[PDB]
Design a protein around this ligand. Structure first.
Ligand SMILES: CC(=O)n1cc2ccc(N)cc2c1
Ligand SMILES: CC(=O)n1cc2ccc(N)cc2c1
Lengths: 245, 179
């Protein structure tokens, strides 16, 4: 993550991120809504950061330092550029909504009143079709990526040294290859609980409550569609095993 | 320090997300209780053995049967959670969660955890449950369910007061270290 965004999201909550004199100006219900929106954006920033570790540190490092067989790096990190494109764009939109809302003269004091529309746009039309297509492909390749990783770590000396070298720093503690893959698979099923809790504290403006109710339904539809399009690919699985599924 | 993987399973009302948060912070959040848990690698020393225990939540995956099993590969210990203020969470253990975990995690130890033990003697909980001809889960009911499902052990904790939380994760580490 870039320093500007890391510092903007360093606090444990929105109530601790904003100045105390600004916090005092809002009703309890607004602070509750704002803390949950802040958690959605902060976790999105961390998810984008996980995708940058996978593309820049892992994938690109293996291409530039290792002599693996063709199709191996792609097998390890399926759809990583498409996932990074979907979420970097979604993160840009969330950060721009926060930026426009800042008080003049402040880089930390803001209130986001209109998240629903942004969430409807992300989880509908072409962007939803691309999310559905990408996660259906990624989650169906999850087991194959893990098995390919385990095999390479156990049998390839230079691959093992590469992994131990780039995952040694403490800031990578939670972000080994397999941990990154599961963090990404689990991301999409975090959206309904974040959105429902934001909706819980967004009854003040009827149009906002309606837009978040629509967004929640679109997210659940996306998850149901992705879940229905999954079948784990297996390296070595014969056609007979597949058509007798 | 050897690396082990822990996954917590159970109904959403079992308080699994809260349990992982309170353990990983060694504090019940005073300002904001997070809606979600990403992952965490806890440094634990149990009986003189140092372990890095990776923690994972399954909250949000309950209605997605093809997404949910993706959390299970290479799991070393399962925490099967239910809430003491909810007899309905305990009923979903033997024929929903238990057969799933035994299929995707064969021979992996399971610790059955009774969460929210601080609500067993809560007057508001007792009055609310009596409306559905129910009452808080009794300690023997938890032990009998753990015995029946072939659990490694039975434990209770409170994420609210922190009582028993550390013990659950130190025991999960011992179970993950076993042959
Ligand atoms: C999804 C939702 O409505 N919620 C998630 C929560 C997490 C913690 C808490 N104290 C309340 C919550 C309420
Ligand atoms: C969730 C899922 O796909 N499952 C497949 C199973 C096969 C056998 C069994 N006892 C439980 C299962 C659970």
């Amino acid at each position: 993550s870039m320093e500007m965004d890391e510092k903007d999201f360093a606090a444990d909550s929105w109530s601790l991120a904003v100045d105390s004199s600004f916090l005092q100006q809002h009703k309890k219900e607004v602070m509750k809504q704002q803390d949950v929106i802040y958690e959605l954006i902060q976790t999105e920033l961390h998810h984008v950061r996980t995708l940058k570790i996978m593309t820049r540190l892992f994938r690109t490092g293996m291409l530039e330092e290792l002599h693996l067989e063709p199709g191996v790096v792609q097998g390890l990190f399926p759809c990583v550029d498409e996932l990074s494109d979907i979420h970097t764009r979604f993160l840009s939109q969330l950060l721009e909504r926060r930026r426009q809302a800042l008080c003049p003269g402040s880089t930390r004091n803001f209130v986001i009143h209109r998240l629903g529309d942004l969430l409807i746009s992300q989880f509908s039309g072409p962007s939803a079709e691309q999310m559905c297509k990408t996660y259906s492909e990624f989650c169906s390749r999850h087991s194959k990526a893990l098995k390919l990783y385990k095999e390479l770590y156990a049998r390839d000396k230079r691959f093992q040294q590469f992994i131990r070298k780039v995952t040694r720093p403490a800031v990578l503690k939670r972000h080994g290859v397999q941990e990154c893959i599961l963090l990404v698979t689990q991301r999409i099923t975090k959206y309904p609980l974040l959105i429902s809790r934001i909706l819980q504290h967004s009854h003040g403006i009827e149009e906002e409550r309606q837009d978040l109710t629509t967004a929640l339904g679109l997210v659940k539809e996306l998850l149901s569609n992705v879940d229905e399009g999954i079948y784990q690919l297996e390296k070595g699985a014969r056609l007979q095993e597949i058509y007798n599924r | 320090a050897i690396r082990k993987k822990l996954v917590i399973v159970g109904d959403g009302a079992c308080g699994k997300t809260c349990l992982l948060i309170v353990f990983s912070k060694d504090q019940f959040p005073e300002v904001y209780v997070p809606t979600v848990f990403e992952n965490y690698v806890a440094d634990i020393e149990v009986d003189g053995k140092q372990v890095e225990l990776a923690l994972w939540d399954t909250a949000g995956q309950e209605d997605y049967d093809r997404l949910r099993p993706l959390s299970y590969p290479d799991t070393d210990v399962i925490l099967m959670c239910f809430s003491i203020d909810s007899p309905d969470s305990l009923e979903n253990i033997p024929e929903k969660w238990t057969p799933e975990v035994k299929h995707f995690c064969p021979n992996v130890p399971i610790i059955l955890v009774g969460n929210k033990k601080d609500l067993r003697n809560d007057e508001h909980t007792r009055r609310e449950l009596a409306k559905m001809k129910q009452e808080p889960v009794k300690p023997e009911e938890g032990r009998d369910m753990a015995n029946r499902i072939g659990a490694f052990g039975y434990m209770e904790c409170s994420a609210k007061t922190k009582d028993g939380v550390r013990e659950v994760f130190e025991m999960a580490t011992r179970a993950a270290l076993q042959a």
